[PDB]
Amino acid sequence: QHILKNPLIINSIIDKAALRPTDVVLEVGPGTGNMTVKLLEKAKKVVACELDPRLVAELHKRVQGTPVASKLQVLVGDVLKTDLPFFDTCVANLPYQISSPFVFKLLLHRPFFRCAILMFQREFALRLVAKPGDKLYCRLSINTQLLARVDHLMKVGKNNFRPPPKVESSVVRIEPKNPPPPINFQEWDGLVRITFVRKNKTLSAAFKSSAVQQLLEKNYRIHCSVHNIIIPEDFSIADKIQQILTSTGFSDKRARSMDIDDFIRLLHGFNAEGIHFS
Amino acid sequence: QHILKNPLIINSIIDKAALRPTDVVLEVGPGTGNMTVKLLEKAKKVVACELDPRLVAELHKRVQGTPVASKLQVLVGDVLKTDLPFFDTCVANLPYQISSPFVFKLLLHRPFFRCAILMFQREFALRLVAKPGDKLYCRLSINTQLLARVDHLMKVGKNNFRPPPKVESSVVRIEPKNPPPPINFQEWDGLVRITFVRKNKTLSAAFKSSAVQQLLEKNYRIHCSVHNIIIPEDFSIADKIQQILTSTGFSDKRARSMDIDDFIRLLHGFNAEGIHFS
Ligand SMILES: C[S@@+](CC[C@H](N)C(=O)[O-])C[C@H]1O[C@@H](n2cnc3c(N)ncnc32)[C@H](O)[C@@H]1O
Ligand SMILES: C[S@@+](CC[C@H](N)C(=O)[O-])C[C@H]1O[C@@H](n2cnc3c(N)ncnc32)[C@H](O)[C@@H]1O
Structure with a gap:
């Protein structure tokens, strides 16, 4: 659980999502809600998907008593098992452990979403955008590139999280090809x-x-x-x-x-x- | 002008050519015709390429009045400046100084031939067939292997030639990759x-x-x-x-x-x- 804590990086991620006021935003791994509270001011609804019940209760508490509280739905549990609702955009900061299955879940999700702005470990991000035969070109590269336009947007230092992870991170955009x-x-x-x-x-x-x-x-x-x-x-x-x-x-x-x-x-x-x- | 004069090595080279009765054989550097007269008996046509008009005249004389004389065509001059006809297989004994240009001439030749059995200096031969990184693995090895399958077939001591060269020799097989x-x-x-x-x-x-x-x-x-x-x-x-x-x-x-x-x-x-x- 590495909490993104740099407000500038958070603002850039949200900007890259190009939110519309009518959007439903899927937020996966909301942590302490640093991004959630800003997303809630820009979109019609935020559906936050969170594994840890303690972090769920605390997210509800964070928005309690604010004018935007009613635009938050918190889905409790493992996102990989969840039947995902319709959403327009996704922002996500998930542990490396679930990065691969989450990308595949996103690529096959229907109805189509518009884009996803995702935080990944640097190597995983490089793999998604790798060209034939880069050293990092693999199943993940080709499967992602078949079904989506994928772009490496920004490098994010470990210093930006609390507690810091052991590797550098990257923000990636995934826009599913529609029709595929x-x-x-x-x-x-x-x-x-x-x-x-x-x-x-x-x-x-x-x-x-x-x-x-x-x-x-x-x-x-x-x-x-x-x-x-x-x-x-x-x-x-x-x-x-x-x-x-x-x-x-x-x-x-x-x-x-x-x-x-x-x-x-x-x-x-x-x-x-x-x-x-x- | 090192003429191959060991009948057993001549027989072995012809054997490695795997002649078909319908084949057109390009023989480059026929010398005194020791191999030519044997090739004529096994192939449909032998196109012999020879630089020295004296050797050409002797080669005509050698086949003159024999039943296979009509299957011999002699192209006179530098094989490097010769537009080569279609041939199925090639046999060659050329001076060392043109081994490299001749190999790349053969490899660019169209339509594709089936195989070439060639005599080279020992070191040149070892470079053609060298694998990554044998001591002699070099630009020649990889440029030749890009375009052909190459095998070292036999060592040929200098005494087998008249007059002898200053170096030991080898017989190599070249088969062009088709498609390249x-x-x-x-x-x-x-x-x-x-x-x-x-x-x-x-x-x-x-x-x-x-x-x-x-x-x-x-x-x-x-x-x-x-x-x-x-x-x-x-x-x-x-x-x-x-x-x-x-x-x-x-x-x-x-x-x-x-x-x-x-x-x-x-x-x-x-x-x-x-x-x-x-
Ligand atoms: C704090 S982030 C860590 C990611 C890290 N910052 C990185 O470099 O990508 C993990 C967040 O996602 C939540 N989470 C972990 N697994 C989850 C899952 N399977 N489904 C939904 N949320 C999950 C955590 O409880 C926490 O809110
Ligand atoms: C090349 S010589 C010497 C071959 C020797 N055993 C060796 O390994 O170097 C054998 C024959 O090739 C002929 N020859 C030399 N240069 C030639 C060329 N550019 N085109 C066609 N024939 C050539 C010679 O006249 C001779 O008949």
């Missing part, structure tokens, strides 16, 4: 997971792993049962996989150097041959 | 040359040289002129180069131990930031 690309995110993430796990291995090597071959063969057999496709007696899932890698040109490539165009082509090429990822 | 990487060679070689000057020192030391910083700043300014990108007054090429090396993880890497995909990645990292080596 016409791509099944579950399939996409299956392919991305498999190829990035060892992002430095060629795809040929990545797909040779027993765990990979076993699931892909199982799902392919299910596929064929649905679509009435004969599987020869001498079927080899290794050969089937390798011929797709060859035909798409990605066999000798490594996920760390592959962009969105590349993975879309690869996914298309697996799908055309009956391989569908979970 | 879609990399502009002048661009690629710009990066390769720079980094291989001191192949045992790091990339950040290679990129700190005055002349290199001047080149890259000049090229970035050209890219920015093309795209109408404004360059701030306080622009630092040193800083921009360092950020790219840090982003990609290459600051402390050395050309002697970098493979092809390493160079592709580094080149992409510069090019995507507007910095070109051509």
